[PDB]
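Model the whole thing, not chain by chain.
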Amino acid sequence: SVVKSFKDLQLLQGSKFLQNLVPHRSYVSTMILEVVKNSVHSWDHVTQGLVELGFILMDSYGPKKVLPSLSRMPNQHACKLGANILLETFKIHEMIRQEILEQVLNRVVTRASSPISHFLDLLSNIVMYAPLVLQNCSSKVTEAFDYLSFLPLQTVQRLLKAVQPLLKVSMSMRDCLILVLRKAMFANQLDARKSAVAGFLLLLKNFKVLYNSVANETFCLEIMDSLRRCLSQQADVRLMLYEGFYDVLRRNSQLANSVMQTLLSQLKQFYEPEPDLLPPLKLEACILTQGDQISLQEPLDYLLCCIQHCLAWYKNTVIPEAFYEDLDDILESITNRMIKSELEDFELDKSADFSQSTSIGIKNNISAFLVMGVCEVLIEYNFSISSFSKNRFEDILSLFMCYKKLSDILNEKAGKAKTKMANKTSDSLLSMKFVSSLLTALFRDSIQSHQESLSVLRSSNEFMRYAVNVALQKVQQLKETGHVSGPDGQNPEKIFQNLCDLTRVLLWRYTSIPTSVEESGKKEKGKSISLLCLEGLQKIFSAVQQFYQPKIQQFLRALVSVTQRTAFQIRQFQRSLLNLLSSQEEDFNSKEALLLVTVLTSLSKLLEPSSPQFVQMLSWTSKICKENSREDALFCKSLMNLLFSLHVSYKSPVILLRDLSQDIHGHLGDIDQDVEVEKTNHFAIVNLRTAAPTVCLLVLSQAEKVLEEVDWLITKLKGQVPNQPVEKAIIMQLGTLLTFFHELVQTALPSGSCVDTLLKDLCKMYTTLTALVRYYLQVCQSSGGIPKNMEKLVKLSGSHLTPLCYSFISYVQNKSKPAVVATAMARVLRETKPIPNLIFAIEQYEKFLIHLSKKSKVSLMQHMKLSTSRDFKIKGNILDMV
Amino acid sequence: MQIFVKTLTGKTITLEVEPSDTIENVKAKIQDKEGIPPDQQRLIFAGKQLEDGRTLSDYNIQKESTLHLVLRLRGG
Amino acid sequence: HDIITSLPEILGDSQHADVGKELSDLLIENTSLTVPILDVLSSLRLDPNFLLKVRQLVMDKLSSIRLEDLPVIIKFILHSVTAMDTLEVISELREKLDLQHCVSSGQSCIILLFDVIKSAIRYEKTISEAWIKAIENTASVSEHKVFDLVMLFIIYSTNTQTKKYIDRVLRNKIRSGCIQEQLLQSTFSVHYLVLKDMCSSILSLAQSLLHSLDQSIISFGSLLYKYAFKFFDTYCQQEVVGALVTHICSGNEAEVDTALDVLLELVVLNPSAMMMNAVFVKGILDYLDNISPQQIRKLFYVLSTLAFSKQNEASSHIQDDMHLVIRKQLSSTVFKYKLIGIIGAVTMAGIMAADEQCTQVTSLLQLVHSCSE
Amino acid sequence: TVKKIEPGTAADSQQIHEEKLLYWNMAVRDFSILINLIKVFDSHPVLHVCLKYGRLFVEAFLKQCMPLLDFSFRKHREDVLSLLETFQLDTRLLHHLCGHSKIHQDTRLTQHVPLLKKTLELLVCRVKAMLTLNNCREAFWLGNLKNRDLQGEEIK
DNA sequence: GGCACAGGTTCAGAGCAGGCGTTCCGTTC
DNA sequence: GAACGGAACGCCTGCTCTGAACCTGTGCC
């Protein structure tokens, strides 16, 4: 009943036609939370059933499909109702909250074969509400620690966040945990090492700011010595430390003098501190080769990244003394000796050809990524040091030239084999904050003191289309996973601030500079900087609405309600698409137009569906579809989808389906080979090229959505037995799309997916009519009826649709215009189905018409003709073949 | 203090009990004033079956509260 | 031996596989030093090819191993399985394992081996699922052994997401003429100490099997309860009786019939065990309005044969209480209560009639004749 | 009887294929002789019997003849064509029977029309699939069927 | 003339709905 | 009034929905 409630609510909110007819009844979700709210009066026979319902809902409908809309959206919503029922039961009934918490912990531990993300969200909510109650389950928690080497890293990393209010209180459990983690570092299973580093970094993080402080400053200095084990271990266990130390320093300041030392000695195994030896880093010690097994260990790029970030933090917030004044000279020597290294110092490009079969090619491919990362960190560092000094920007440009040299060397070596090397598309080591503050300074700095040094970077266009691409990579990385790579990379307020400050500059570069100002040619027309700023705008607009959904007020303030700001942001892309369409025909920009449509699509979802700005938006889109030719098919598909997504939230889109069917009929031809039709006046984006595989499938898909809404209405009406407006609406919808189906049945469609989707939607049409008739059976037996609406609809289905279906079937079968035998047999036994399924659906319509005609004393079968049937023959073509 | 006890035949009986007294004391009072045996008695308050070992203070029974008495005849 | 057993916490990552080779140099040198070297190679970091080699060197000599070595060996075998070598090593393991030639240290080391197997199947689905799928692929030969019952109970208890698949495999295995009484008797007579952990899982399987048709299945559902009451502790006995009263008071006609047959078999087998839990059997007298008169006859028979054993005349409380409830049932004007009173009176007089007992049956028959006049 | 007949393989001898095709031809001529008795015995139960068991015969013809026709077509083409033009002669009678059950609006008859109709259309499309897998797909013609009664007229 | 991206296709899996099997009440001569 | 046809509750088959990966076709270099 709860999942059917959620499918009701989603399908009811999806359309305006359904909201005009139905007045909203209470849903089963708000009933069950009312029950939990009303259980405070404390009849506690219920509460055990509420806990058992909550665990049933979280168990059955957890993300395991997600390791769509039909299987997705009413199965997140049932799982969130489960966790919401359990949390509300927990926050009311003080007796229960040892059997809820044990049952959650039983599912976090024994599982983690299956996803348990919903349970680790429930555990965090339970604990953060009342952290004292975990002292009731001190037995069960301490027997989860004994298994915190077999759980994966995600479980451990979040369970140990939850637990630690125990460990501030307790002392025996704390000294149990450290013992578990220290014995876990010496495991053989891979997850145990990274679980141990996650536990160590959390204990360093939140176990004092600086109990007694003298009992902390030594205790972290114990753990820190244990962490000098992990830096000796393999690459992933190192990399978790290099990414964690910045947060450790932020939340625990006084460990700084230790932590930097832990890094600095780690640097000294790979840095050769003698000048005039040209490769300043030891990359031949960062590769572990034994038994023809070649592995990266000690990712030096992330080490330099971590040293740079902690150094900048120490300079910024600590100072307002020997380790950092050394490290400045270390990084400066690394910079100055990295600039004048010409790839013969790392044995690259001529002694190596980067072949990923030989060990030497794999080693060179690893060291290539190493030197690229090192150059990226040094670009960020040289930008960091000076207030815009012209020497260090030339240094930045030379480092980028080395980076781009290695990048296009790997591009040349990736041009022979398949493009499976996604390790070249490995994330840049620029922090999101730096790429924000770099693009801002690149595109929006007019201060004359800075301008001479910035003109070194603005002159080189490759640097610009690197430093835009990197921000595109960052926002794409926020789309895929909910957090980005760098420092403050999981802290959503900082990600929101950097997305606002990326949007502000990308809009400026797209707006203030058009695409027609180019001097670049086709190679750079594929990747023009205006187009990349528009693409980043499309990814930002998309990725705000997933995550920063409450803040779409404040996100628009960065650039009066949501509708006015969204409309003003819409109008710029609207004018830009008009300027791109109306102006040129010759070789018009397909990509820019297509993702302008994508930007407008993402932006139109923020308008209120009854607003005047929504109405002018729908009117503009309809006028664009009514005017422009635009022979490119994907752009047409994107425009029509934008039009339908706008239209279905305003009113039922059956008249638009009818008009598009009439244009398809006019364009594609006719079955009989002599019927003269042309009705192009309706919609202009329909061609001989366009309409056949592209507008046909799209209009059929929208027909299916209309038929789904009508079938849901009929099924709801069959529940009750208020009525007459619902039946009049159903009959008007069905008559309109019956005319729609008529025009497509007569049409001379191609022999691909268009004919098959038509046949399947005709079965869906007839099934919907069969369900209407079978509903009228229930009513008309009681009183006497079939009013003139239903009789007229039956007459229309008999005259216009059905005999044309028969002639269309004969057209499909008569039309006849290298094969692996098993797949060929599978193909033909697939293709033998949809004509019989249409024949069955017609005959089962007529049979329920017979039933109705008998027990209503009105002969509805006098409208329809006698069923046409078909016989095959075989001709004398078999003598030619054999 | 005073409470009401309503049984299945609609008979309402007034009981003079203190919240410190246990539930079998209330069943003994029903045995004295109505003759119904305490093993057959079953007491319901606010949709909760009263246990024997508790008192009125465990179930938050205040002044003029209404109990429901049903007769649990094992076989008949 | 102490130097060997301490090697995982000493050595760093740069020196594993070297000591990987040289420990195997000591492995062929002595057969007295097989097991600490095997535990160390189970706990160190090794490449899978060498691990495959040493796994073959273990697996060829599996029959020449006394039970004391068998946990630390089999752990090593269940943490050397690859993603591709699952079914082969599981089938070879289930073939080669005897558990009979080894059989006070034996039972304890058997419990250690089953602890090891529970730890191996807990967190790696690739061994549990392949073990279940390697049992139904030996449905052909009727000669599978005690191990495949205990292992199905273990995987049914431990892993929750494979419960339905184990249930379906057990139904389609028992309908094939496979696992029957002669396996279950040997299982619950030998492996009673290992299964004594999983009382609740065994009774859940019995409850799930009693609900169906196909009297061969319901036979197994009865015999599971029977053997669980036979071998386990007093707490599991109490839980068995609770489950049986749950089947009687709730379930349908086949369920009530089967559970009453089981209670009759357990009171005729062990009255002294049922006398501790006789209040739970007394608890069926609340639900006489839900039970068919034939099952009323059977219920009164099992209760009244429980009450009238000679050594349990110190526990006369049930004997006076059911006399009370019979005289209460008979004293009703309603025919539906008088029917149950008459049935209980006659069956009670019959069981208690195998000089004062003659006067007792005299009084009982005279009172039922007086009220039934 | 006819559901128990199994189609062979191409590895099987041509003698077993020939005897199976003779066996099928016997069943089709018996089915035609059985169906043709409709016209002289028109009632509720005789029409009910042929409506149910007609589709149950055609489904057996679909599942356990058409693989044999797919196998043995390049060798025994004339037998296959003779079999199909024989099966058409009572398939037409079943179509007229479905029509007769619709026209006299008889509920107890009409409940078995849609699965029979679906099954005859499956038969047509399965013949097209046969010619597709035997590389004569452009020989499969079609054409409408005159609406006759049980005796044979043109009701219009 | 080859490589990369897109889109189709095909297979594998899983879950549930509808149709047939038993059992009883309505309807038609 | 009798007999034969319409009607409901449970279990099995298959069909469809969906995803994932492969592969093939087309366009640009």
